[PDB]
Amino acid sequence: REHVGTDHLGNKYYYVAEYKNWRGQTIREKRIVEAANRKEVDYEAGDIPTEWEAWIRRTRKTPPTMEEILKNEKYREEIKIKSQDFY
């Protein structure tokens, strides 16, 4: 196992490559999350950063940098403003 990030929300991500255990069964590689809640029923869309989901689903090759997410927090918040001016 490895740690990769602990976002603002609280979720903790891990990366786990391929290893073969006692008899060498060959456990397959994984990209996992550990959420703010450990109950599946209580999982709602948007509980995960949109950027982080990408690396979880392999669309994004390498893990995000928290600053990269921080920028996304900027643009998203104030993009709704600049469109109010430009009618």
Question: Could you list the residues that contact other proteins (CB under 8 A)?
Answer: 25-28, 30-35, 40-45, 50-51, 53-54, 56-60, 72, 75-76, 79-83, 85-87
Expressed in percent and rounded to 5, the helix, strand and coil fractions of the chain are 35, 20, 45
CB-based burial, 36-46: b 16+ in 10 Å, e otherwise = eeeeeeeeeee
Nearer residue to other proteins within complex by CB, 7 or 53: 53
Shortest gap between Cβ of 13 and other proteins (angstroms)? 10
Comparison of 4 and 54: residue with beta carbon closer to other proteins: 54
Distance in Å, CB of 4 to other proteins, minimum: 13
What residues pair up with 14 in beta bridges, in sequence order? 3, 32
